Symmetry: T
């Protein structure tokens, strides 16, 4: 069984980093993270901060 | 990092309330709720109860 | 078996009412209406009239 | 020919109001506004402020 | 209030089983599971293992 | 001309059956059913009953 | 209240005709047809026959 | 940089014309129109007038 | 088994022709072409050339 | 690099089989098939034959 | 009220830059740019130039 | 006529590279590659490898 969590990473360098950012939180706090699928991307402006929302996937048990 | 939870609120008054309803649960039980995005809305009939499913967003740490 | 009909309700008060409006037609004319799912919403302007298109669901037999 | 503008209204009462809000800006500043179609809805929390993003439509010439 | 979790079941018999598989995990670990909605389906090949990703829904409190 | 009806079949065995179920109602009550397209699938839990919503297509005249 | 029916027109000349084709059936058999929205288009080959599936809309009462 | 405008053309001959119609307005009033992408199509009935909504694209500066 | 290829036809007359255009290439080079489904349509401007992208379907063996 | 092919399998038993059916063609004729993702499902009626369209994925080189 | 404009940035380095590119045009010419949401990304080839289409958002008044 | 192929590139540096990766395979093996459109992006974890699935487009003849 996999499970997914919907996290948004933010970096002031790139979207790819913005992804890494969240994947790193999922990993700080869950074991067996298997993949992640990008569901959205945006830029905070209002430094400019890029965001990448990921469904992080992770094997149950 | 943000995180999201997929909750469905229900009110017998309106969709807006049906949203409030869930946002209030997310808040009962999580700190730093930042926003929420409506992903669906329906009406239970089978009183008539309106539903609004929200992705509730909330800042990690 | 359920069946669905694609109806658009209109109210000059709100979207929630605009939904009620149609759900009330489905009920005038069908027995066992079980639920309804919002598929769209708009505003006539050209009073301002709000619309909510619903797939109204109803149990066959 | 119609044209559309992508505006987000916000009210601290409801989504329907959040729609009205923007439709009122489109009207402050354009003639012949014909309709509007809801493309999204959210709630600012981080008072609670409801949003409704509309494609506002308006007849050219 | 309902809540949902995004789980992927896998069976080497069918998609329907692949669904059951996850619904059984949601139930091992949560009370009041009300329904589930299929959001995706795939086949691992690289025995052939069918997958069905479900949003499992479950009543809060 | 084809026409379509939006029906949901339910079986306690599988999604495929859940489809058959509705296609059988469309056929009980319409002549020339040509095809059907799956638009959704879910599981009632709250026995476990699988659902498959179909747009059933059928030739007019 | 509007209602919609999901019809597919076919012409061996064009998609636009393929639309007209169905809108003409909706009109043969319903009063107050208000508009129609194209939901799909295809070509039968297996003369070449173009199809346009429409949600035909029509005012109730 | 490109920019886009969301225009709806209408012709009483065809969808293709309904597209041309708007692309001609974009051109009346903007320089460097590069392409356009069809986002929707409908028929006014309530002569029969075909519509094609386009995102018209045009190079900035 | 069917298979599909993702081709874009272009004509300076219409979208329907733009479809024919590609369906004719699929046929130049494959046997048993069964149908085709329109996935997109656009206009080159930057004569005006209409495009229709098709998934062309064709029976394997 | 992966590559994908868009195939439709058909079985007169189930959707899962209808998937297997195509995955078996992809394998008859390509090496390293890694996975497959269901993009659609339908039933031929006009025996009843279930279909499952798959994007079959397969590692290049 | 927010408003949005649909711009496509292009860079020969990355998608993130391709985003920055447009966000910089929106800013050259509008005050209060609040955020931006990625709606598409592509690569011109026919140097290789990456594109990122953004809905740039900006507070009215 | 254009044609498209559905390829997934992977890089351990970024999504943009993950795109380049596949566009480079399409070019190794086809003449006249005109553009490419991003349809998905993910990260293998289970080094971290970023993926970008592209529809690579290429002019026939
Ligand atoms: C928007 C919406 C969609 C529904 N869809 C279905 C369906 O596909 N199949 C079905 O068997 N019943 C469905 N239900 C519930 C159904 O209407 C009856 O609540 C119940 O099955 C018995 O009466 C209780 N409840 C609230 N929301 C839901 C939900 N989404 N699903 C189930 N229970 C819910 C739905 C309800 C709503 C409000
Ligand atoms: C959400 C929405 C979308 C609309 N879209 C269009 C359009 O694309 N083209 C167009 O010519 N007119 C459209 N209309 C109606 C238009 O606004 C005017 O009602 C009418 O055409 C003459 O004034 C009456 N009415 C209510 N809903 C609709 C509807 N969806 N379409 C037509 N009439 C409706 C729309 C109205 C709404 C509320
Ligand atoms: C529906 C919605 C979605 C949001 N999404 C994000 C997000 O992805 N990333 C993010 O960093 N902040 C987002 N915000 C705003 C965020 O909630 C806080 O407003 C802000 O970033 C600092 O607190 C102010 N405001 C209103 N709508 C928006 C919006 N869509 N985006 C930004 N500001 C807005 C969103 C707000 C709403 C209402
Ligand atoms: C529906 C589906 C989609 C897949 N997509 C990819 C992909 O885009 N890129 C990729 O590198 N590998 C993917 N995989 C897994 C891949 O097929 C191999 O499992 C693995 O990468 C090494 O062999 C293990 N497993 C089960 N589901 C997945 C999944 N969705 N992603 C990863 N592992 C999974 C997918 C598997 C499935 C079943
Ligand atoms: C529907 C459509 C969308 C387009 N999108 C873009 C874009 O996002 N970015 C861009 O730089 N150019 C795009 N083009 C082509 C662009 O319009 C000019 O053809 C070219 O880039 C130089 O002039 C040649 N041609 C035909 N279709 C396409 C296509 N989809 N993409 C590229 N070339 C095509 C598009 C063309 C069409 C018809
Ligand atoms: C899911 C599905 C959708 C279909 N859609 C249409 C349609 O839009 N228009 C139409 O004229 N016929 C369609 N057909 C086929 C139609 O049902 C009859 O097969 C045929 O046209 C004559 O009888 C043979 N076959 C299997 N799948 C298809 C397919 N998708 N399209 C055509 N043949 C197929 C469809 C069949 C299926 C299974
Ligand atoms: Cl989710
Ligand atoms: Cl429908
Ligand atoms: Cl837009
Ligand atoms: Cl494809
Ligand atoms: Mg920096
Ligand atoms: Mg997002
Ligand atoms: Mg009340
Ligand atoms: Mg819902
Ligand atoms: Mg009033
Ligand atoms: Mg509507
Ligand atoms: Mg108040
Ligand atoms: Mg929005
Ligand atoms: Mg077995
Ligand atoms: Mg999945
Ligand atoms: Mg049983
Ligand atoms: Mg359903
Ligand atoms: Mg002819
Ligand atoms: Mg169709
Ligand atoms: Mg005429
Ligand atoms: Mg439209
Ligand atoms: Mg000409
Ligand atoms: Mg296209
Ligand atoms: Mg049998
Ligand atoms: Mg299909
Ligand atoms: Mg460089
Ligand atoms: Mg784009
Ligand atoms: Mg590295
Ligand atoms: Mg992918
Ligand atoms: Na989730
Ligand atoms: Na319908
Ligand atoms: Na716009
Ligand atoms: Na393909």
């Amino acid at each position: 069984v996999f499970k997914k969590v919907l996290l948004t990473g933010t970096s002031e360098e790139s979207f790819t980093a913005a992804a890494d950012d969240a994947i790193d939180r999922a990993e700080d706090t869950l074991d067996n993270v298997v993949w992640a699928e990008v569901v959205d991307q945006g830029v905070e402006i209002g430094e400019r901060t890029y965001q990448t929302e990921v469904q992080v996937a992770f094997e149950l048990d």
